[PDB]
Design a protein around this nucleic acid. Structure first.
Lengths: 63, 100, 51, 102, 216, 67, 125, 230, 213, 38, 22
RNA sequence: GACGGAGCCAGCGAGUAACUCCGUCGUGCUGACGAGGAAUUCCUAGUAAGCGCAAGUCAUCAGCUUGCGUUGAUUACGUCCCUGCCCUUUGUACACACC
């Protein structure tokens, strides 16, 4: 599949997350408009770019 | 807001609209202060002395002493706060700069 | 496939020392461990009574 | 300035100066057939009667790079590509020859 | 003399650390000492030279250091140090049994504890009650519910820790944590670094009155 | 109303841009009602201005004439 | 008399002294040549002060380095620190101070652990 | 056109353990072969319906869930099945309490219930049992998780009752020898087959109504046999 | 045309230096054999998370890359690989042995497939780093998971760990040493040939992430 | 013979219950000795 | 074990030791 | 890995090793074992761990204890979602701002 690549623009705070995962507002690179709130697992900084299998589902809380 | 730091043992705030003092942070023992810095988001005020080897941190919205953070073994010559990511940089006569 | 039977001890209990065929070097381990545990208990008994 | 002969269960490598074995390898298990340098002249191939053709670095006998099996017939000849540095031709008595890629 | 300056003004902080290449049972016991005190932190001792450890701790401004020594898993000694060139007592341990051996009944309480000292009578008793109570969090509440008992029993400080709760018909108990028969054997006015300071007091093992008297 | 002042700044930072969009639709249907608009006006203003200040980069790249 | 300079260099417990003087270009560690330095895989860790900046700066000086203490990797870090700051101090004193801060720029851009050891540790968290 | 192998004499096929986890293989893992031994004092008793009526009702669980015999006849069906003599089987069972027991195919299994149930406490209380020549360890309990000893690209299925039916012949034939396929045989009494839904990612049985465990795993074994033509 | 003359007497010093060393003074190569330039992270999203812009001589820089958070993503990738390669209970501390065995490893990587082994190991990392996984969320203590995405630091770290422990486990009881086993593992990972341990575990983990997505 | 020093008192049920009723009395009366603020 | 002993109120570990599992 | 050589680096103490190199062999075992299972415990930088080396300091310890040197990593350095534990519910402090 064509896979997409997206720049983190904000790490979310205060979300009630599973330990380890962190919700994150990431924004795409082939375009520059559409942002989407995924959730990552490892340590994540502001403006690292991460590879996304999907482009149509943002996640939510885990618990 | 502007902060002023003295040898009285006082880091005191100043409002520059009513042109008055409004807060006065002291230590606990009247030591002379020598350099100060303040978080750009004006929530903490840090001062460093000649004779205590520490950095005193005060909250400014409540005047109580927040903490005293250490690590040097000479007097802290100069302080600063980073204007964006709020890390603090101190420099002391231990031939040492330290990032908190 | 080449087939092998097990090497099995019927009525085997790991706590209790079973009937090993070595009368020469294994029952010596049985009675020597018995001697060691009774000599340990006797010297512990006499030193706590000395205390 | 060096050269190899294919003795039985060993390959012997000689110089142009001392005129005797300067290096050799003798941990083959069967009679070996083919010894062949690659065109760069760094490693060398050797095919045996077992059919597990072995390539290993020359000027250092005690290391074996990779011993890959051909067909179970004795690999009679094995020589590298004359200009390519990564494809190796082998032939045993399987009535088929192979261009392996290392 | 080094505690009226900072008696109840600053709450202490304590670093608890093991001897050198410690056992797993010793590290469990050091964790238990960290859970016994408030505001203590267990620090891994490995390749830490004792001079650069002790002055790195004193430039980091901690108040007390508690090293521990062992013998085949059984802990045998501890050492209380006070840092602004304060005194070090050092004690041995005799009947030490731990909750990690006995019962896995969940977590401990970590509340600001109360302190009980039974018949510390002499001047050495006052010095050791000062060196023992100035490593606890200053001024606990009224309804704080864990207490520590340090009972002198013929120079054998029995140490236990209890969680009490008052009924109206009385008060019932649940001990938890460590259990010590510690005893003082040295005390010197320097830190742990020197082995050059003046001996304030150490017990005399070999006089001909080594067993008659108490707080020798 | 019932969410607090402290965690609000991340409470309406969690939500995606589609939820920002329907929040704008809510702001239309709440300022077409002057009964409760005037009784929650600094709250509505602070929320709306922080929402579009944080989402400004996607807002001005949206292409909707009705928006 | 002859122009010389003595510098030090310290890893954990190894200590390296460097006598750098005006000479013909010989670099010796305890009389051994610089090529014959064990453990043979950090010979380039020893080489990089005289390799980063080119041997033409080493053509007129000769260096003798004594080393004591420490293990293998501590000794090779001590050697390279002593070589580096001996060259820097020689150029600070006897020749071009412009070449001095050229060399200092090169070494600090590569790693300043080749000029200043990181002494004051640990941390009581 | 291709010349024949120089030794068509059948010598021994490679009997394996978890040392190799690449080759084409039918892994069977038997779920809920409960091994609970209470030693009266005398000797142990297992979890059977017919070794006690007392101790099982002292431990409170019901009667019908006592089943080492059904997993025993399952593993005997496998140890007489031709893939066990071919060399593409590596038998993994696990107690519901987590005891991952592996069977290497060098074994002459006890051919009755009593000698099997007496061998099991030898296995449990030595964590090992050796062969009659003692050059390989032929039956042993080893490390959890089960993925520690099953291969990496191992497609996981289990026995299903409430799931549709496929053709397991082409279900294995779509893959090659660069892959291993594992089936979780649920040998419980009754209930829900969610014991290993952490691991199994595709759930399928081979008839409309529920099987028994031995004929179900023999169905999957004859499907693997028709796939590999054995 | 144009010239620049900096040296005016050739290098003739009293301790006669090796000629390959005084040839390496013109440009830094790893191990005096592999030039760090013309080596690119073919992927994006791992550029500036695998350090290759700063050339070294051997893989034994003694910097401090564990005190801050992300600054272990700036020490170069070769010694990142050898520090993960030293990790096992039998052979802790022996990083000189680790350095020399990855020296022999990437040397035979070059003599098999000759582009340069640092490019081989860089795109081996980019092909082995997993792009999604799951997390074992509670869900009432059921068999419950949910697919998430992986930050590139975790991608690089897990790729290095997978490659090193795959080389160890494939060289446990075989004739091959850990050197040539890591060599063939890195070559298969560079092609992405679905044969090596790390690429198999990567595709398995992304498979279960896609399944439980 | 004679001995140097009194050895370790082996902790008995009666001595631990004696110190237990001691701490019962003490924590009933709340007459313990802690530090105070300043 | 504070909540458990509170339940014992509203309804003594160290005189017994223990050992390991199977 | 076993060999047979070669190599060179350690700090604590004064009571009349490792590793490296060169050549050679070349790995299903002990007359009870093939790396330790179920699970559990502990652990965040000169830390886990490997390697030695001294000393024996009024209590403790020689089956060891304590120091000292060497070699030296992987993973977090976030989060209160789970397990808990604690604190507060006048913000009360002197502007601005928020509540």
């Amino acid at each position: 599949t064509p896979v997409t690549l997206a720049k983190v623009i904000k790490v979310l705070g205060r979300t009630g997350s599973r330990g380890g995962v962190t919700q994150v507002r990431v924004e795409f690179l082939e375009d520059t408009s559409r942002t989407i709130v995924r959730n990552v697992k490892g340590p994540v900084r502001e403006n690292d770019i991460l590879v996304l299998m999907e482009s149509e589902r943002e996640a939510r809380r885990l618990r | 807001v502007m902060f002023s730091s003295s040898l009285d043992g006082t880091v005191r705030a100043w409002d520059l609209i009513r042109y008055r003092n409004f807060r006065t942070f002291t230590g606990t023992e009247r030591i002379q202060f020598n350099c100060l810095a303040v978080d750009p988001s004006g929530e903490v005020v840090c001062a460093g002395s000649l004779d205590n080897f520490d950095i005193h941190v005060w909250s400014v919205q409540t005047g109580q002493l927040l903490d005293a953070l250490s690590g040097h073994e000479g007097p802290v010559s100069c302080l600063s706060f980073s204007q964006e990511n709020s890390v603090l940089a101190s420099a002391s006569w231990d031939k040492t700069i330290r990032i908190w | 496939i080449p087939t092998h039977a097990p090497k099995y001890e019927e009525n085997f209990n790991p706590d209790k020392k079973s009937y090993d065929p070595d009368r020469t070097r294994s029952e010596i381990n049985k009675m020597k461990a018995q001697l060691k545990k009774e000599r340990k208990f006797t010297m512990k008994e006499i030193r706590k009574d000395a205390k | 300035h060096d050269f190899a002969v294919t003795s039985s269960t060993r390959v012997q490598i000689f110089s142009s100066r001392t005129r005797q074995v300067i290096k050799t390898f003798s941990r083959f298990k069967d009679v070996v057939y083919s010894a062949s340098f690659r065109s760069d002249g760094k490693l060398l191939c050797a095919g045996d009667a077992t059919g597990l053709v072995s390539v290993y670095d020359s000027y250092n006998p005690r290391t074996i790079l990779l011993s890959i099996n051909a067909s179970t017939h004795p690999t009679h000849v094995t020589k590298f590509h004359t200009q390519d540095n990564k494809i190796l031709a082998t032939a045993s008595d399987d009535r088929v020859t192979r261009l392996w890629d290392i | 003399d080094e505690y009226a300056a900072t008696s109840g003004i600053m709450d202490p902080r304590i670093i608890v650390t093991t001897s050198r290449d410690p056992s797993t049972r010793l590290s469990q016991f050091a964790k238990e000492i960290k859970l016994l005190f408030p505001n203590a932190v267990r620090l891994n001792r490995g390749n830490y030279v004792m001079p650069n450890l002790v002055d790195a701790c004193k430039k980091s401004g901690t108040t007390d250091l508690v090293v521990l020594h062992e013998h085949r898993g059984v802990p045998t000694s501890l050492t209380i140090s006070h840092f602004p060139h304060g005194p070090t007592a050092q004690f041995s341990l005799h009947n030490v049994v731990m909750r990690h051996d006995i019962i896995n009944a969940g977590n401990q309480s970590e509340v600001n504890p109360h302190l009980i000292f039974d018949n510390f009578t002499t001047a050495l008793g006052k010095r050791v009650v000062c060196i023992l109570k100035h490593l606890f969090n200053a001024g606990p509440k009224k309804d704080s519910e864990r207490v520590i008992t340090f009972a002198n029993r013929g120079d054998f400080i029995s140490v236990r820790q209890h969680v009490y709760v008052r009924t109206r018909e009385g008060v019932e108990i649940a001990e938890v944590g460590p259990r010590f028969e510690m005893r003082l054997f040295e005390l010197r006015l320097g830190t742990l670094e020197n082995k050059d300071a003046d001996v304030e007091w150490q017990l005399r093992r070999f006089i001909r009155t080594a067993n008659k008297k108490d707080y020798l | 109303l019932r969410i607090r002042m402290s965690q609000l700044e991340d409470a309406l930072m969690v939500m995606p841009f589609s939820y920002v969009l329907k929040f704008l639709k809510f702001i239309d249907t709440v300022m077409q009602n002057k009964t409760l608009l005037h009784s929650h006006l600094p709250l509505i203003c602070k929320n709306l201005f922080f929402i579009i200040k944080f989402n400004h980069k996607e807002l001005v790249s949206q292409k909707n004439e009705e928006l | 008399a002859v122009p010389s300079v003595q510098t030090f260099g310290k890893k954990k417990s190894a200590t390296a002294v460097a006598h750098v003087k005006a000479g013909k270009g010989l670099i010796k560690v305890n009389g051994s040549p610089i090529t014959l330095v064990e453990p043979e895989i950090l010979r380039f860790k020893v080489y990089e002060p005289l390799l980063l900046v080119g041997l033409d700066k080493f053509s007129n000086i000769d260096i003798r380095v004594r080393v004591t203490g420490g293990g293998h990797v501590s000794q090779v870090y001590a050697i390279r620190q002593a070589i580096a700051k001996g060259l820097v101090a020689y150029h600070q004193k006897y020749v071009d101070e412009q070449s001095k801060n050229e060399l200092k720029k090169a070494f600090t851009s590569y790693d300043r652990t080749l000029l200043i050891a990181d002494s004051r540790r640990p941390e009581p968290k | 056109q291709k010349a024949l192998p120089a030794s068509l004499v059948p010598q021994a096929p490679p009997v394996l353990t978890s040392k190799d986890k690449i080759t084409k293989r039918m892994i069977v893992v038997l779920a809920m072969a409960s091994l609970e031994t209470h030693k009266i004092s005398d000797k142990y008793v297992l979890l059977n319906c017919d070794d006690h009526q007392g101790l099982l009702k002292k431990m409170g669980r019901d009667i019908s869930e006592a089943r080492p015999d059904i997993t025993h006849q399952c593993l005997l069906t496998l140890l007489d099945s031709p893939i066990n003599k071919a060399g593409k089987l590596q038998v993994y069972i696990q107690t519901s309490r987590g005891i991952l027991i592996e069977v290497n195919p060098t074994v002459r299994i006890p051919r009755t219930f009593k000698r099997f149930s007496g061998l099991m406490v030898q296995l449990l209380h030595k964590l090992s049992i050796r062969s009659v020549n003692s050059e390989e360890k032929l039956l042993k309990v080893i490390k959890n998780p089960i993925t520690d000893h099953l291969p990496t690209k191992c497609r996981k299925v289990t026995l299903s009752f409430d799931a549709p039916v496929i053709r397991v012949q082409d279900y294995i034939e779509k893959l090659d020898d660069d892959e291993s396929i594992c089936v979780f045989v649920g040998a419980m009494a009754r209930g829900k087959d969610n014991f290993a839904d952490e691991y199994v990612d595709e759930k399928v049985g081979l008839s409309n109504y529920p099987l028994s465990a031995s004929v179900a795993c023999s169905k999957f074994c004859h499907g693997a046999e028709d796939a590999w033509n054995i | 045309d144009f010239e620049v003359v900096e040296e005016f007497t050739p290098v003739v010093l009293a301790t006669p230096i090796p000629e390959e060393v005084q040839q390496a003074q013109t440009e830094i190569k790893l191990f005096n054999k592999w030039s760090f330039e013309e080596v690119e992270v073919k992927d994006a999203s791992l550029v500036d998370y695998v350090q290759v812009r700063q050339p070294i001589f051997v893989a034994h820089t003694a910097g401090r890359y564990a005190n801050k958070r992300f600054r272990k993503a700036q020490c170069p990738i070769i010694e990142r690989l050898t520090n993960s390669l030293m990790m096992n209970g039998r052979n802790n501390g022996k990083k000189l042995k680790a350095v020399r065995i990855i020296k022999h490893t990437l040397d035979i990587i070059n003599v098999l497939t000759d582009q340069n082994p640092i490019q081989v190991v860089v795109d081996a990392i980019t092909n082995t780093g997993p792009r999604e996984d799951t997390t074992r969320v509670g869900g009432g203590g059921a068999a419950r998971r949910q697919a998430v995405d992986v930050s590139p630091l975790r991608r690089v770290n897990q790729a290095i760990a997978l490659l090193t422990i795959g080389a160890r486990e494939a060289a446990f009881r075989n004739i091959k040493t850990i050197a040539e086993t890591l060599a063939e593992e890195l070559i298969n990972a560079a092609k992405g040939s679905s044969t090596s341990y790390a690429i198999k575990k990567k595709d398995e983990l992304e498979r279960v992430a896609k399944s439980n997505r | 013979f004679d001995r140097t020093a009194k050895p370790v008192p082996v902790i008995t049920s009666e001595v631990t219950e004696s110190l237990e009723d001691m701490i019962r009395r003490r924590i009933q009366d709340s007459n313990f000795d802690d530090l105070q603020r300043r | 074990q504070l909540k458990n002993l509170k339940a014992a109120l509203k309804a003594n570990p160290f005189e017994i030791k223990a050992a390991r599992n199977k």
